[PDB]
Design a protein around this ligand. Sequence first.
Ligand SMILES: [Mg+2]
Ligand SMILES: [Mg+2]
Ligand SMILES: [Mg+2]
Ligand SMILES: [Mg+2]
Ligand SMILES: [Mg+2]
Ligand SMILES: [Mg+2]
Ligand SMILES: [Mg+2]
Ligand SMILES: [Mg+2]
Ligand SMILES: [Mg+2]
Ligand SMILES: [Mg+2]
Ligand SMILES: [Mg+2]
Ligand SMILES: [Mg+2]
Ligand SMILES: [Mg+2]
Lengths: 130, 56, 117, 113
Amino acid sequence: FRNKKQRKQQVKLRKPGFAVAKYVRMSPRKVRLVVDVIRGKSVQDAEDLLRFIPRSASEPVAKVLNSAKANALHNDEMLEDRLFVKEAYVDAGPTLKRLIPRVPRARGSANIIKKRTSHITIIVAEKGNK
Amino acid sequence: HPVPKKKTSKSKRDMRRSHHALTAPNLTECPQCHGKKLSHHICPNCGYYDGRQVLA
Amino acid sequence: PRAKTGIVRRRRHKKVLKRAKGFWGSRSKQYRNAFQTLLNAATYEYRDRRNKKRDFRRLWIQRINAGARLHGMNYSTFINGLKRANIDLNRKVLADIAAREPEAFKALVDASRNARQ
Amino acid sequence: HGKAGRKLNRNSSARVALARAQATALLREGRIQTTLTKAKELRPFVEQLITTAKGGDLHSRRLVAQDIHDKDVVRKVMDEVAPKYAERPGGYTRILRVGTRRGDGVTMALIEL
RNA sequence: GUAGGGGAGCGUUCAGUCCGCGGAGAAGCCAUACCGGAAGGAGUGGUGGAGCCGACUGAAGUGCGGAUGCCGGCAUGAGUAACGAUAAAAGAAGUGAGAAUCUUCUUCGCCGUAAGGACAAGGGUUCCUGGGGAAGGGUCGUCCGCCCAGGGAAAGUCGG
RNA sequence: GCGAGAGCUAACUUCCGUAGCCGAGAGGGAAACAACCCAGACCAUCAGCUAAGGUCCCUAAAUGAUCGCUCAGUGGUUAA
RNA sequence: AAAGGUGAAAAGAACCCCGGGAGGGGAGUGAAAGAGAACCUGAAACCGUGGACUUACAAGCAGUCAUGGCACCUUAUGCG
Ligand SMILES: [Mg+2]
Ligand SMILES: [Mg+2]
Ligand SMILES: [Mg+2]
Ligand SMILES: [Mg+2]
Ligand SMILES: [Mg+2]
Ligand SMILES: [Mg+2]
Ligand SMILES: [Mg+2]
Ligand SMILES: [Mg+2]
Ligand SMILES: [Mg+2]
Ligand SMILES: [Mg+2]
Ligand SMILES: [Mg+2]
Ligand SMILES: [Mg+2]
Ligand SMILES: [Mg+2]
């Protein structure tokens, strides 16, 4: 152990099976719907479902799923035939603004806003339960 | 006129959203190009539906 | 020189907030509604604190005349005959003597009988 | 309780000029792909039209000449296409569903001769 | 025990002293079942990375739930209502990481005292070429009146 | 509540007297209920006695004892 | 009008992986990348993911008291 910064510098902090889509312009509430079916089953199925799921959010959710498998297979030296989504989840976003509607309490009322809210991330592990 | 009275709570609201749960496609692997296709349509991969159809 | 409100309000608030636990929804989370829940919470605290004693009174009695009746007397009759005997200043919590230890409570009954006729 | 034989999507004049145009094209190309329902509409309208064409008289041909406005298209259906189906009890058109679409999320399909 | 009066005090910024603590880590933030009659105050554990408790005295922009209070942020209404004229569109072909929407062909419907054409005022490179795909475009986007760069505008007689 | 006026010897009325409560009063009773009945809460107690009120079951406490009444659900709506 | 902060120092991330991209995962530099250019801390509202105990005859200012079940034992086996 030693102390705080000792631990800090003897250890570099890995992130196995992890990858994240930041800032995809889309509403996370939507994206959760796509994601919820993926979560828990084998990354193969995940690729299939995602190929065939009619939501447009399905698109960048698949794009990420592979990167996180791709990270798992290369950086973590894992086994793609043991691979499954350990976890996935979506939130956040610096919800977009140009602030072009300068608002004098009137005449445009309230409209717009375009959430950047995506932040899609997925995490892969090996089953090994068998 | 007719506006809502209070905000709705997180609890009752998600209770409303109880039903929006997505149905994931029930898939099947294609007998020909061995990739997963969708029932009563063409396998997007080979193009085969009973013998062969689209050119992909 | 000025003193900004910094970390003073926040502290107090955090304390109030922490007092709120299994509190349902808004109560347990945002300040004002928590605090003002805690006003009525005070009311019920102190008052029920004076109360639970009336409550347990009730319970114990409700047992005592139950056993008495199992033996053929009642709370009125039982404490009447018991206290009619300067013998028993016995009184408090005697319920569990009826509940746990039957033979004893029986003897106290018969005592209450000899102290009658 | 709305009950009838016909489906429309647009108005009364449209569904015509469209069913005419789609008939015209399927006979021109031999297979086209369009939204699934539009194909389901197209099927029996063009099929009956294959049958006006066979039987081969000038009358028949001038009946065809109403819906089919391209003289080349009609000559093809009449001389090439019609006769070719002969011992065919009627009804060559079949319908194959391809799959869903990107922009509008609509499932689409091929109707083929 | 309400206005109201009286008494003791808690906490916060600054200042002077006093004592000190801190890279083996300050304040701040996080949790917490301990202490105190209350305001409150410590114990340790997690964050942090350059400073800071305790004591005495003095000075205050010194204590917020309210004011349809102020700036900000984020909810509810909800994946609702809408997507800005009921002049319909259709197939093939092309390109591309991806096309209902961009390009081409062939048809279709619409204006045609216009919904065509030319000027004035006003706008200010919006024109053309080659790119580009963040935002802007009520969807999309390979596209654009958006973004980048380069080019383009010629007068003795027209208008001054 | 009492003692008067205005009023209709009406008003959860209005205006003076007069005690008490509310106001600024929590606790018990009156099903609920400012004022009414009992009683003015310094703090702790899984101890005891009582007040107004109650002691068939919702609820603690006699389904008490003795002499009547009332058969109407009077009780638990008023009069000539 | 609002609008400040990598790091001591640019050493500001060669190279590799998924992707058109955005974005991230490694490697490396660094005391630290628990500093990565949406670069000091990073509260709260607010949205999620996982877990523990729970909920589909119950009339609810969300609390309060009393007991039982269940789970957990760093101010912490007790008045928890
Ligand atoms: Mg019918
Ligand atoms: Mg019908
Ligand atoms: Mg017409
Ligand atoms: Mg919709
Ligand atoms: Mg609605
Ligand atoms: Mg509706
Ligand atoms: Mg429009
Ligand atoms: Mg049209
Ligand atoms: Mg016309
Ligand atoms: Mg767009
Ligand atoms: Mg009055
Ligand atoms: Mg009453
Ligand atoms: Mg314990």
